[PDB]
Amino acid sequence: MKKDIHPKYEEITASCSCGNVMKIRSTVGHDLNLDVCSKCHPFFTGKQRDVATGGRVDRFNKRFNI
Amino acid sequence: AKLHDYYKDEVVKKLMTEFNYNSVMQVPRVEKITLNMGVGEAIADKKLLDNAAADLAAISGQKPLITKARKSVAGFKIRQGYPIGCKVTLRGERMWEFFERLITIAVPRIRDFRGLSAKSFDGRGNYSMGVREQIIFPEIDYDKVDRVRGLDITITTTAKSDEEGRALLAAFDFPFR
Amino acid sequence: PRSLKKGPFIDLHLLKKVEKAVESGDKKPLRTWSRRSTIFPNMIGLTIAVHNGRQHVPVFVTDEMVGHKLGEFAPTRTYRGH
Amino acid sequence: ARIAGINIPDHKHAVIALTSIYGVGKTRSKAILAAAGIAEDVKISELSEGQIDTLRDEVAKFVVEGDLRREISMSIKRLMDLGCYRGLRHRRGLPVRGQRTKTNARTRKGPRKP
Amino acid sequence: AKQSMKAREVKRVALADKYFAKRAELKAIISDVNAASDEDRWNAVLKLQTLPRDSSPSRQRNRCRQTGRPHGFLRKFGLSRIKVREAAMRGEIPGLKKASW
RNA sequence: AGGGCUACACACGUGCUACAAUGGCGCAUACAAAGAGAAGCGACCUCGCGAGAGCAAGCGGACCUCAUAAAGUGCGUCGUAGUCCGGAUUGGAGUCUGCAACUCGACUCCAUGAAGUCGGAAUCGCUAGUAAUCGUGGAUCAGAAUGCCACGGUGAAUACGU
Ligand SMILES: [Mg+2]
Ligand SMILES: [Mg+2]
Ligand SMILES: [Mg+2]
Ligand SMILES: [Mg+2]
Ligand SMILES: [Mg+2]
Ligand SMILES: [Mg+2]
Ligand SMILES: [Mg+2]
Ligand SMILES: [Mg+2]
Ligand SMILES: [Mg+2]
Ligand SMILES: [Mg+2]
Ligand SMILES: [Zn+2]
């Protein structure tokens, strides 16, 4: 490849909220902590057979009085 | 590498058993992934092209080919030789790395994601998706983006027809709504 | 906003409609007039059409719009420009 | 004098300097200096590097410039993708919480056009 | 006051003071932390909301008892500003006089 | 039943808040008057940074509550800066009224910290407890005032003359 013209392309760890951690040689600059992924997405594995950790729970499920 | 190994073993085996081929090379390979940004507002702010170039550089660790106006088009007010775009071609290990990054990070982060369009082949098995928000890519910081532009992406496959291309991509677990 | 000691709000007629819709509803949108009902996670996947005053604008419920009510998505004052 | 990524000024009292952090006003600054045990009548000049470092990690216990920008901008973008009332006001550039627009909407509309 | 509005206020007073002692206990059930939020409070909300809207005391406009005028009402005299001035100046309201201090 | 009177390229009237040091901010401590209360005022104590919540006495009221007045005075800090002035916008989290606070209530907590550097032609009020300013109560009121109607605290300058 060429030299002194491309950005930094180190090896980075990416950890999602469901516990799926992926080793990927990427160009970001620092560690990553994402939320969704292939394993924790509704459409990919069961639309009503997935759980989330966001707007459906944190803001709402703590406060419901049903 | 990892997705390439997954290809070499599982996708080659399942394609072998499904298609009943006489040669291992008769399964679709992948030529490249071309990330394109047809800026088109460069005529007003020339700097907006350098930001798109920096954005492609961010997404994929390659300096972008500043693509040139193919011919003069008076309707869009472009001459011959004015830089109205930027692209990058990723093939090899870099193709696989970015490809994993996309399929495992960006395809779930799509806004109101209801699967991927199942009709985006030319007619011989070359896939072509357009994303409407760049933000799905993990590389983006969002703290230095003047405009939330979008981009398209072409997965160039060595497939013979649309069925074989779809088979190859579906083996990689694409949503295919 | 509504206090936590009283919980959320939803009209009873709309509530009954929402369980009937999420158990055997696949036919037509739900034409309601209760702009004051907070969206629940049960109604996820419905295309309820809330009354904006003269018609009912359909709104497909998305899982990222939680603490908002049906009147945030119906426009009440049309204004093209001056 | 290099907390959170800015160049927080000296010669100013304890609280008055940490206000410059996008995310630390008067109260959160008093809370930081309380957890750090430093009196509020002293400057940011004669504080040693280690004290500055514990101030740094207490600021890091709170949200900071880049992170705050990120959540508030994603809140605004969530408003505009909902296509809700607040989304229309943020898009159109009008008051969001319900103020009057017939008059006295200048701070959200800009100065008078014609 | 169009006579209709008077009749409306009559039916509102009737439904309020008849459905009373029911709306109030539901409000008490909602307000107390000690009662379980889980089911009793939610069902109390539902029962409260299905009660006819007219039965609330927050729909009392307190019109004038004679001329039904919604605005200018005074709770003390129970009359609009006009009827207060006329009846008070003629002399049918006890102890009232043009003040000057 | 919902919406609108709250709509917004604009222009005008009447107010509030500032542009700052005679001030802002923290702490300590004074001095009122006039009102309102029972489908109401609501001690105390406890919980919560706070709005406020539970418990709950007293009071149809020169008795109880709203209710701690503030400016002031002392102590420090800021040092003439678009700033420790300003709090307009905007995000997040709430409290209270009410069936229900999204269009469309008020406050509270955190963060965001704009215009604004005393204002052109012109134009308004005031001859004394007045103007200028500081605070409190009422009516309306389920909740919702910077408006209106009241009450007190400091407290001027000038009037040659027509
Ligand atoms: Mg700050
Ligand atoms: Mg009322
Ligand atoms: Mg009437
Ligand atoms: Mg009006
Ligand atoms: Mg003020
Ligand atoms: Mg009295
Ligand atoms: Mg400024
Ligand atoms: Mg400011
Ligand atoms: Mg005179
Ligand atoms: Mg004198
Ligand atoms: Zn995951």
Side-chain angles (χ1 to χ4, degrees), chain A, chain B, chain C, chain D, chain E residues 1-36 41-101:
Chain A
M1 182 98 55
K2 293 175 175 174
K3 282 149 303 306
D4 68 0
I5 256 169
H6 290 347
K8 277 310 169 55
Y9 206 77
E10 67 276 16
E11 183 76 28
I12 205 51
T13 76
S15 302
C16 79
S17 312
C18 85
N20 185 23
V21 187
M22 286 75 76
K23 297 289 176 300
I24 174 66
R25 198 170 186 268
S26 179
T27 177
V28 286
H30 42 56
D31 281 4
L32 171 65
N33 265 313
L34 73 165
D35 185 74
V36 68
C37 67
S38 58
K39 311 299 169 294
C40 49
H41 190 274
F43 195 92
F44 279 86
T45 45
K47 298 180 300 186
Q48 220 249 0
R49 198 197 61 82
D50 210 330
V51 71
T53 185
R56 296 292 90 189
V57 291
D58 303 312
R59 169 193 303 117
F60 204 83
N61 271 23
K62 77 180 171 294
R63 84 188 55 248
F64 72 121
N65 282 326
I66 301 176
Chain B
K2 179 173 176 183
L3 194 40
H4 186 228
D5 288 332
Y6 169 60
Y7 173 64
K8 277 177 287 182
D9 181 271
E10 293 81 2
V11 188
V12 187
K13 77 183 179 176
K14 73 187 71 175
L15 280 182
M16 271 313 326
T17 70
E18 280 186 42
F19 279 110
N20 75 3
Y21 281 160
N22 183 256
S23 179
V24 55
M25 317 270 293
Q26 211 166 336
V27 311
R29 279 65 47 89
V30 290
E31 284 107 354
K32 74 201 160 48
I33 301 177
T34 156
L35 277 298
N36 348 259
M37 298 256 282
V39 167
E41 293 87 6
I43 313 186
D45 188 74
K46 65 156 180 292
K47 320 194 311 301
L48 288 179
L49 188 61
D50 315 317
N51 198 0
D55 179 89
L56 282 176
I59 289 158
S60 296
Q62 285 179 4
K63 179 187 177 181
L65 171 64
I66 298 170
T67 65
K68 296 295 287 184
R70 169 177 57 96
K71 57 183 313 176
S72 54
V73 192
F76 301 122
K77 213 144 289 301
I78 58 162
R79 223 196 48 251
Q80 193 69 96
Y82 183 51
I84 64 153
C86 51
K87 88 174 178 174
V88 288
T89 287
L90 322 174
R91 55 169 69 254
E93 92 279 24
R94 306 281 312 276
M95 191 211 150
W96 290 120
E97 291 170 323
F98 166 86
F99 188 50
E100 296 183 9
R101 213 145 52 242
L102 178 140
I103 189 173
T104 66
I105 301 189
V107 181
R109 204 180 291 178
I110 298 191
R111 184 180 276 193
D112 198 0
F113 172 82
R114 61 168 74 184
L116 300 173
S117 182
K119 42 170 186 177
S120 296
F121 298 96
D122 60 53
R124 281 189 198 78
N126 289 303
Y127 205 67
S128 58
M129 293 297 297
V131 304
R132 329 293 177 99
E133 57 276 351
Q134 59 181 13
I135 304 301
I136 69 179
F137 289 164
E139 299 91 11
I140 291 306
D141 54 353
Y142 185 68
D143 282 343
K144 200 183 171 294
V145 290
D146 55 356
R147 179 181 53 249
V148 62
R149 242 196 69 119
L151 54 84
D152 45 357
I153 189 168
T154 301
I155 313 288
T156 57
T157 301
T158 70
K160 273 73 181 167
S161 67
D162 275 24
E163 280 65 26
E164 214 186 329
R166 184 178 302 292
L168 176 78
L169 297 173
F172 274 160
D173 296 329
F174 283 34
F176 284 147
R177 73 160 169 258
Chain C
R2 174 80 170 285
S3 34
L4 294 174
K5 282 86 176 183
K6 326 185 73 189
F9 199 86
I10 175 172
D11 291 3
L12 247 178
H13 48 82
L14 183 64
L15 187 152
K16 291 296 99 174
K17 295 156 136 179
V18 173
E19 290 90 7
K20 272 173 283 175
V22 298
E23 165 86 54
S24 65
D26 288 329
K27 278 72 68 178
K28 186 187 66 62
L30 184 71
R31 184 176 287 202
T32 185
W33 288 256
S34 85
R35 313 180 78 243
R36 41 160 166 188
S37 67
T38 197
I39 288 167
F40 283 166
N42 295 9
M43 3 209 293
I44 206 64
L46 273 174
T47 328
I48 58 163
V50 63
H51 191 76
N52 59 356
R54 303 321 164 88
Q55 66 288 36
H56 304 74
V57 36
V59 295
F60 189 91
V61 285
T62 78
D63 39 0
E64 59 89 20
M65 80 202 168
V66 243
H68 302 213
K69 293 176 200 59
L70 295 177
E72 280 79 321
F73 313 129
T76 44
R77 297 200 266 257
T78 64
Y79 163 67
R80 326 273 161 81
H82 287 91
Chain D
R2 296 161 267 173
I3 298 192
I6 335 111
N7 181 281
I8 301 184
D10 285 345
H11 88 283
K12 300 310 289 174
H13 294 263
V15 295
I16 305 310
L18 281 73
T19 65
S20 70
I21 302 190
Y22 186 98
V24 174
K26 182 62 66 66
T27 125
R28 275 186 176 179
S29 161
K30 265 176 184 67
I32 288 307
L33 277 338
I38 307 300
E40 306 286 18
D41 208 5
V42 67
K43 298 185 180 183
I44 316 297
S45 298
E46 63 273 20
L47 314 192
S48 69
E49 300 86 32
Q51 186 69 51
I52 289 299
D53 181 315
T54 175
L55 293 176
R56 285 189 86 261
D57 313 0
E58 293 178 353
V59 169
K61 189 188 58 185
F62 290 165
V63 193
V64 300
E65 294 224 10
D67 292 329
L68 208 55
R69 264 73 169 265
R70 189 173 290 100
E71 290 93 9
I72 65 171
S73 299
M74 293 290 185
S75 70
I76 303 179
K77 291 314 157 298
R78 182 194 58 85
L79 284 175
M80 316 182 59
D81 79 352
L82 287 4
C84 64
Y85 171 85
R86 302 161 42 92
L88 309 182
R89 307 304 208 179
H90 269 297
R91 185 179 296 255
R92 194 56 200 271
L94 285 170
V96 191
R97 312 173 170 175
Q99 291 80 319
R100 67 185 293 161
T101 74
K102 173 178 211 172
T103 335
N104 307 140
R106 311 256 57 90
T107 196
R108 192 63 228 269
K109 209 179 331 285
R112 286 122 177 174
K113 327 297 171 190
Chain E
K2 283 189 75 196
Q3 286 290 90
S4 300
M5 287 181 211
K6 299 178 67 62
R8 282 186 223 186
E9 283 279 77
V10 168
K11 277 176 176 300
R12 290 216 177 103
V13 161
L15 261 269
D17 81 330
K18 181 250 286 181
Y19 280 76
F20 188 51
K22 208 173 305 177
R23 170 164 296 255
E25 52 178 11
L26 288 155
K27 289 187 302 179
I29 287 308
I30 299 308
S31 66
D32 62 355
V33 297
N34 303 115
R41 185 172 297 181
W42 184 227
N43 301 138
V45 164
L46 279 28
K47 184 67 175 65
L48 179 65
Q49 108 152 288
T50 189
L51 275 186
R53 296 323 204 193
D54 266 328
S55 52
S56 56
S58 289
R59 289 162 81 104
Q60 295 298 290
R61 175 57 186 173
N62 282 348
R63 314 188 159 264
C64 179
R65 289 229 186 110
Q66 311 47 19
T67 63
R69 199 191 178 240
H71 289 269
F73 183 72
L74 298 173
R75 288 169 181 255
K76 181 65 169 177
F77 307 120
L79 296 172
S80 85
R81 351 178 318 255
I82 296 91
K83 289 299 167 284
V84 166
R85 177 188 201 244
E86 67 89 15
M89 174 124 302
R90 168 152 55 226
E92 305 98 317
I93 299 206
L96 199 46
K97 293 190 249 295
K98 278 166 60 68
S100 298
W101 67 94

